[PDB]
């Protein structure tokens, strides 16, 4: 029980730990990448915005 993984955990403020647990359960980043249509849509958005840039 001497590794730093224990260390930060008891140096966590409790609410930050619980927010980590909740957004761990929530998994937003995985859903946004797994959805095909919105992913390739935002790819098109940034691509032709870059194309308009130079």
């Amino acid at each position: 029980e001497n590794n730093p993984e224990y260390l930060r955990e008891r140096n966590m403020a409790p609410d930050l730990r619980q927010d980590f647990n909740m957004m761990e359960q929530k998994k937003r980043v995985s859903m946004i990448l797994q959805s095909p249509a919105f992913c390739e849509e935002l790819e098109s958005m940034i691509q032709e915005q870059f194309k308009k840039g130079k």
Binding site: M22, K26, K27, I32, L33, L42, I46
Partner: protein, 374 residues
Amino acid sequence: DDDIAALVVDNGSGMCKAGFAGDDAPRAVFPSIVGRPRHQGVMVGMGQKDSYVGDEAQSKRGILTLKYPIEHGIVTNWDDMEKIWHHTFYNELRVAPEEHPVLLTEAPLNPKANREKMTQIMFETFNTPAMYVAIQAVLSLYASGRTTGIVMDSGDGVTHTVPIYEGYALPHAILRLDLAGRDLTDYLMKILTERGYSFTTTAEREIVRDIKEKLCYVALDFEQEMATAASSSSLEKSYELPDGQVITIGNERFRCPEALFQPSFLGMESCGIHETTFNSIMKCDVDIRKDLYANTVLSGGTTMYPGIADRMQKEITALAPSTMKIKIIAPPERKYSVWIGGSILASLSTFQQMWISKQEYDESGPSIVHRKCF
């Protein structure tokens, strides 16, 4: 890409978040404070640094003068930001900056010299291979799953509302307002002095901020709620100070956030947040009004007060035209959303053309960031 993940570093005015791209959770979130000792140290062998940064500084609040490097969304101490970035890279994550790309977020409207200084600092000293600068309010809509809508953001620095139309930030309709969490904390002190409790040092400001975070809510109707609070004592709650004393907040719980809706309490002559959002939509063209009223996203640290959603909906309904589609979309994780949007944006394969190489910076100076990143 596969071997190395870009570092997602969100530099909020009050807190700093850091993690790896493609991951759900940031690895380290810590306050953006730097403290210097204020008393003479007489113990020879216990070890005293010149300055404490981050959570170590906030642990020893009693012997430090806490200073914030970011003031009203404007950096006022650049070497202090060098310290906070050094603490982020080396201590919190234990990763070298020269082997991974970094991603930086920024306010929608900042001076040009600020962007130039961030680019110069990030390339000259840390020697990062690739960096990119993104607007803070844009990434929240990407985290929302949306490409069209109005984004209201409120942190410890400043509160601004922007419209986004298929990923385009309209520069004319972006509106700014100086109602942040720090001003609410100062007003909480100013109204706490009525009951008889006095806080004056920078150490107690964290106590007052914790009181604001834990015991506040937004009244749906102010006039009825003041009569309710005067009639009975059921609204009063007790808080237990670090030295063991117990205070009763009572009436002030719905008086602290009310400065957001009526800025005349703080002496500011500006309009409320609801009028700011209404005027921000009013400045755009007619064609996109329908999908701005029908699509509103709240984000930022200040927007997690309980009951802010219904009050915001009612106040924006009172100003909208008749039979108008009005809806407020507030995610529960609304003040971790900027990091989520940054990791999402860094995760894509077509994003890799956004990176600024070291050769490009060396050729074109610090002014290349504005031409490369529009």
